[PDB]
Each structure stands twice: as C-alpha cells, then as structure tokens.
Design a binder for this molecule. Sequence first.
Ligand SMILES: N[C@@H](CCCNC(=O)CP(=O)(O)O)C(=O)O
Ligand SMILES: N[C@@H](CCCNC(=O)CP(=O)(O)O)C(=O)O
Ligand SMILES: N[C@@H](CCCNC(=O)CP(=O)(O)O)C(=O)O
Lengths: 333, 333, 333
Amino acid sequence: SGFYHKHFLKLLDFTPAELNSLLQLAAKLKADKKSGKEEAKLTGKNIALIFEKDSTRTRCSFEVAAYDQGARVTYLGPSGSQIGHKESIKDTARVLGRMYDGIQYRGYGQEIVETLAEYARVPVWNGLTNEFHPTQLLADLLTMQEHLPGKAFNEMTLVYAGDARNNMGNSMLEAAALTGLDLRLVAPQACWPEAALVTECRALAQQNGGNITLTEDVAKGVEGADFIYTDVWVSMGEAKEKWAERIALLREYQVNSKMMQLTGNPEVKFLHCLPAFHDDQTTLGKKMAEEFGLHGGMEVTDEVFESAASIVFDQAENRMHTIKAVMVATLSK
Amino acid sequence: SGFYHKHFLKLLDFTPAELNSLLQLAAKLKADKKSGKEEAKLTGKNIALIFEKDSTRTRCSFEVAAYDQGARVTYLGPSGSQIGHKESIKDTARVLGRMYDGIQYRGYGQEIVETLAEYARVPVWNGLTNEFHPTQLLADLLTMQEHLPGKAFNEMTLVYAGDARNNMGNSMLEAAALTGLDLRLVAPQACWPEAALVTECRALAQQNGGNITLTEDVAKGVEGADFIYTDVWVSMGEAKEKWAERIALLREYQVNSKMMQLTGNPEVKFLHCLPAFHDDQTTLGKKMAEEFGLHGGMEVTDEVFESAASIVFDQAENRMHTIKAVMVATLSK
Amino acid sequence: SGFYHKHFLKLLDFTPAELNSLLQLAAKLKADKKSGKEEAKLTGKNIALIFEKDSTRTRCSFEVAAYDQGARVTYLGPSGSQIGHKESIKDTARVLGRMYDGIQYRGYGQEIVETLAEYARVPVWNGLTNEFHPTQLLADLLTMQEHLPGKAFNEMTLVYAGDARNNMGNSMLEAAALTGLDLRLVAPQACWPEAALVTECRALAQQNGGNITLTEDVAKGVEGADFIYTDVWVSMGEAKEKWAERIALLREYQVNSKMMQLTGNPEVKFLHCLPAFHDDQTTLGKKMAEEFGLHGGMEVTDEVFESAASIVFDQAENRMHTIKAVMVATLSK
Ligand SMILES: N[C@@H](CCCNC(=O)CP(=O)(O)O)C(=O)O
Ligand SMILES: N[C@@H](CCCNC(=O)CP(=O)(O)O)C(=O)O
Ligand SMILES: N[C@@H](CCCNC(=O)CP(=O)(O)O)C(=O)O
C-alpha cells in the first residue's frame, strides 16, 4: 500500500499496521515458494548491493530473493568499486540511482544510508548499519509468530541478554515499540541502550500493550520468557580491543542451560541472529575460548545452540522471505 | 554493420561513420529503455568481466546493460581468480574465449588488452586501460550531443583542463580526430600528451573541421568553450608519490568559478568522468585538502560540481547506454 | 538415475557405470550447446559457490554451465562472507541449505566438504579440495575419449609425471580404479601417493583391466603412453618454502620434448589441468625461472605446451560441459 518507493532504513518509520502487512506478505511469499506457486513480480528490475561489512545471510538473502522474483543483482563488495572511498556517498548514490531500481546498503552508521537514501531517488534498504538492523527483526518477528501461533505479539515475552547497545539492541526497542512485545533487555548498565530511544520506544510499546524492562538481574529478567535472544559481544566494525572488556562485562549474561532454566517456561525457544561463537571450532572462537576461558560457548553455550529450543536456523531461513517481501513491497505496483 | 565481432580497444580503430552509427544506436537503446519498448538482443550470451583496477560506473554499466539485453555476467575482480597473476594473459584469454561470448578488461596498459584480444577469439572491450578509455568518450560524446542539439561536433568547442597525459587526455585526442571537435587541452607542458599522437590526431581532426590546441594559458584556452572537462590529477595505478608534484603543477588548472567565467559562454557546461575529489568529505580527499590546502575542491571546486553547469550525472548515466550499444553491436546479428 | 540429490565429493563414491553415464550426459550436453538445441533443465534453481582458493576455470565453468541451464549463482569468494572463518562450516552449511538448491566448495581438505555435505541437505560438489579434484578428471576422461575414439579406457595408457601426491595424483588413482586405464605415475618416491589408496585403487583398476604402475624411471614409465599429463610442482595452499625442495626433486620429471620422445608414440598428446608455469612470462614464473634456472618451462616446457600434442585447451573447455552434466544430474528429475 504506502510501501511503493518507500525506503526501509529503521523500523520506527513504519506504522504497526505497515509492519504487520509486511509480515503478512512475507508469510505469503514463503508459502508461495514452498507450494511452487510463486508469481515473480520484480522481473527486469536491477538492484545494486553495496556491502561494506561482511555477510553470509543478508547477502545471500538479497540475492536469492531477487533471483526468485526475476530481478538481477550487482554485488559491490568491500573494496572493489570506487565506493570504498575515493568518492562521496552522495555522488555514489546519484550515480547508482541512474542505473538501478533499488539499492541495498550494509555498513557503518546510519548517516551513510540516510544520505544514500536522500540522493539516490530509488528505494534504499538497510542491510545493517551500526545502529539499526531492521531487516533482521522482520525475520525474527515472523519466526516468533510461526512458533507461537494464535498469539498476538503483545502476548509474548522476549528477553534479550548480552550487549544491549549494539545495533541489535537498538532494533529490539523499535520492534517492541511497534508490537507491544514485553521486551526485556537483560544487560549490565554499561551496555544499556541510549535512554532517549528507550523512553520513546517504551512509550510506544505501552500504547500497544507492551513494556520495555531493562535490568542487570538475570533471574528476574528471564522469568516467564517465551524467547531468549542474544548476539556476539563485539559487533562487526568495533575495535578488537573491546573484546577484553566486553567479555569482562557480559560473561554472566551468557545464554547457558541454567539461564534457560531460570525462565521457568519449558517451551522457551532460543534465538540468535548469527554468526554465533558457540563452539571451540572457529578461528577467533578458539583463541577467545582458551585465553579468557569461555569453554564451550561465549554468548551462547553450544549445548543451548544445538538444543531443541534453538530455532536459529528457522530464523535464519526467514531472513530471505522477509527481504523478498520488502523488495516486492517497495518495487511493485 | 562492420561491428559484429569487432573489438573496442581504442577509438581510432573506427571510422567517423562507425563512431556515429554507434552513437546513434546508443541513443536508440536509451530511448527504448525509457519507453519500455526495449527489445533484448543478447539473450543467452555469457560475458566475462576482468577488473584489475576499481570501478563503480564502468562495472555497473556493464552489468545492467547486459542484464537488460538478457545476457549474464561473471565478475572476475582484482584478485579472486588466477588472472591476478600466476597465469599468462595469453593463457587466460584462450581459456575464457572457450567459455564466454565477450570479455571486458579494465587494467594497466594497452599491451594487456591487445594481447587479450589477439588470443581470445571473442570481442574484447576496453573498460579502461592506462593509455585509453574509449568507452568513456562514447558516453561523453553523446552527453555533449544531448545538451547542444542541432550542433554537429565540429561546431562545438571542448576544453580539457588538468593532466593532459593520462588515459583521458589521450582519449580526447582520439575523439577529436574522429569528430572535428575544437579540442583544447589546457595543461602545463609537463603534462602534455605525447607529440606523436597529437600530430596524428590533429591532422585527422582538421580534416573533419576541428583543431587540437595545446596551451598552458588558461585564459586563452577556455575562451568560447561549450564544455569544460577535467579529471583527477593522479590516476588509478600511479604511485602515491605523484600527488605532491601533480598538485604543484596542476592547481592553477583547477576548474573553479573564475575558470568557468573566463569562458565567456554563460551556457557552458561542466563535465567530469568521475570519481571527482570535489569536497572535503572523502578519505584521501580531506587528507589532501588540509595538507596542500585545496579547500573545497581539487580538480574541481565543489561549487562548480554542484553548479547548474554540472551535467556530470547525466554524463554518468550515459555510460551504460553507450556500453549497451557497444555490446549489442559487437555480439548481435 | 541414482544421481538425483547425490553429492560429488570424490570419484570412488561412484560405480564405473555411473561415471560412464555421467560422461555420456556431458557429451550430450556439449553437443546440444554447439547445435543450439540445448534444453535448459535447471531453471529457477539457485546455487551457492563457496571458493576458498583461487580459480579461473572451475569458477567460470560453474557459472556459465548454470547460466546455460537457467540457474543463478552466488559467488562467496575467499573472504567476503562469514564463511572465511568466524562461523562453523557446520553452521554455514545449515544456513546455505535453507536458501540454495546446490552448493559448490573449493577449499582445503576433504573433511570440510564432507562436513559441508552432511549438514547442508542439498547436493554438494567438490570444486577441488586438498586431496581430491573429481570434477577435473571427468573433464579429462572425456577429453581423452574425444581424442582416441573407438577406444575403451582400458585400451589407453596414461602417464602422469610430477608430484604424484597432490590432489591430482590422488584423483588419477580413482579414475583408473573406475576405468581400467593403464595408469603410470612417474614420480620420485618421495612424492608417491599414499600406499593405502594405491592398493585399493590398483585392485579395482585390475578388475576393470588396468594397472597402476608407480616408478621413478622416466624412460620405462612414459613408454607407449597415449597421454602424458603433469601439474605444477607446488599446489595451491602449500607453503612457499616447498618450492625449493620440490624443484630439487621433480625437475628431472619435467615434461619436455625428449620426454615426449621416449614415449615412442608420435600420436601422444599432452594434458595439463592448468595453470601451468610453462614460460618466463609470469609473476612467480620468471622469479622461479631465473633463480633455479628453469628457463622455458617448469613442469612443462613451453615448446611442448604450444606443441601440436598439447590439447590442454580442449581439456580446459571440457571442464564446463562436465560440470554442467554433474549439475543437471544431481538437481534434475
Ligand atoms: N551486532 C551484530 C549483528 C549481526 C547481524 N547478522 C546478520 O545480519 C547475519 P549475516 O552477517 O550473515 O548477514 C554485528 O554487527 O556483528
Ligand atoms: N584518469 C582516471 C579516469 C577514471 C575513469 N572513470 C571511470 O571509468 C568511472 P568508474 O571508475 O566508476 O568506472 C583514472 O584512471 O583514475
Ligand atoms: N594441484 C593443483 C591443481 C589445480 C587444478 N586446476 C583447476 O582446477 C583449474 P582452475 O584453478 O582455473 O579452477 C593445485 O591445487 O594447484
């Protein structure tokens, strides 16, 4: 409806109704692809994909969703083009807008994608920025909805442990402000999200029947949750130095078994946007695990990651249907 | 006509008539895409795109132009494949020719793309080499033609300030030799193009009614110009060290407002192939701007870049129609 | 037949009949594309292509073969995505399987691609691993078959000089075990393939009428060969240090003219999977050539590489038909 040629930069630029419509379209599109009745809508549209940070899911998601819908893609990865920086984003935008029908941007800081959106004159979607990550939450919302049918979002309790001031924390706030989820940010105070945003989002959440609780206590936070959610303690783009202090702060907020048990709900499902350092298998996974001693998981224990509660791969699948939905909504009819 | 299976390496391998035909086809194709009546011609053709230097426009241009025409693309960026060097270009060519229908090459030095063309046995297009950049000029010629209708090229005066011995300077010469433009290369003598090429191109320009003037004087050069054109003072692939001496030489050749005023034509339009360091916004843009003191523009002032005279983004758009034209001309019927 | 949803990790996971069927399909598909009667089978299938080592042929091959068959491709090159390592291959697999219909993997070590195949739940093809390279041999087998018509594989003598314990040596063994080729691995003992595999493959080769001979003597090895085959002395992923000892060992195993002459067959054709350091033209080609003194070729003399015996470019072309065949076999009907 009021989606055609709209950008998708952060969730609060949308009404509850818009978000819900979107979520509904995504769900249709998912269902259409499994039934094989997918009607391509974006045929002959060309989309540029600017990536300044790495990505497996978000990139792949944009690519297959476009290919299904009959669109083609151009991946301008981190350093390959002039956009790396040797040219204004303002110029880049004005260039790409003359050739493409839509642009994705993954990067550093909302200023960039906003500037990219003013000047491009085509829909700009936020693939993840330093502050927000709207596309993720769409997928998470739907995944939450698919695992608790017949429940409105205001009937669900979502807990987010970990670093609450990263792009994911910020995005949670927006989600709740639009859905009335009972958000619970279990984090040390040092990692709490900026208060101006909490206030705005809290006010809006309560209007819709939710409430944003922030608390350093794990035990009163996780209680009664339908979902536990967490993320890496240092995000993409933050300095390597942060690891030593972030582990120091956040390790009592690890989503472990005891953690899942303090919930009290045996039906509680775990969520994680991924990548997740859950085992002593990776490159910096093993290095961090021996050094500080996070044996068997950092933000989440490997036992919980491979638990029946873990629905992260469903969540992960839902990234692409969600993005397909955003794209057919902003580019068609 | 005598285009099918021809390479596009430098402009002087074409007749004035050929160039003009090409320009005409481009114009048709542009018009067809805006009207939505674009008939795809390159369906089922596969094209490799070798890039050894960066690119936003040229790469994107090749990609969307192919996608529109129903062709697919394979981007072999700077280091990813064996072509980086671990294998002869001679071998690379012979390999790729067995799989693709056409090959683009962006790189260092004409020898490379020529060798690539002898051995590939499919059309090879020059995406930019150290010496030439033919594809650009096609677009610029058309953009010039679209802003001064009812004017033959011999009725137009084009000034090129800046480093006249880069790939762009060299390309100007070819353009004039084929169009009878009144070329004016306003540059310090130290940056003048190689005399052998000037002579050959001058002779040819004059035959077609033009003349290539070289001069260190800004004032007598810019006078009566229909277009001012410029480019970065150090090109891709040149050593970082060159910046200090090139700024030293070329800063009086900055295209600024006074510069545009000495023209005497109030209808004069500015052109720049881009990227352009016109503001104190970029990475090395700001570093260069404080150090040497180019506040508010290096080759071109930001005031002129955002001037109503600036038609650089039209120019930029015209890169892809032009390339689409080259490709349908060399690959179809 | 028993190909749909099968992985293609190493050749010995297939019967002689399966290999031969495959080879036959490839041959059809080749023929169909030249006649222009190619019926696309993989329309609307999306394929991820994980590359951790470089590639020109294998990547290009996967791309055009997919494009011909109406499929689209996503290239996740060496470091761009999270797969580089920051995430388990086990997780990566489970993610990609939810989005794609098939996955290619080029990398380091068979464990990786096997783990990738257990967890992905879609066909996984081995683009080259440290130990095997099955896709190559398919192409080589067909190329061998196209140059000696009316000859069953058991009627052919294939010699492989050089480093017999790389991924290519190992693959030869598998090929013979399935075809009854008279394999001859002419190599120093220090470079002989692991005996457990030789034994298994020898037993199988003999059943089918072949025999795997290993020998340090060049002269008795090359005698009566229909094909001489060789490869670079240090493979992708091995330490740069190995060059000095590998040249020391292997230079008497260079495929030179005298080498081709000791064969005794004047119809003997040369094969090489490529890249080949055959001239003093490359980056590390020239550096190695002056230092150790391999003037005019390392594994193979440039004279032999450009000889009429050289059919390496036919071989190279046959990489993509072969891969197209693997893909339509594992993804269709
Ligand atoms: N705060 C985290 C969020 C990662 C989001 N993950 C994704 O979007 C999945 P992807 O990396 O595969 O696209 C960070 O910035 O590191
Ligand atoms: N002499 C300049 C020319 C740049 C040409 N620009 C383009 O082709 C536009 P692009 O870089 O976006 O493809 C140089 O070599 O740096
Ligand atoms: N043992 C060699 C094998 C190279 C195989 N070559 C290919 O697959 C051709 P490509 O590199 O163009 O894909 C090595 O590992 O270096």
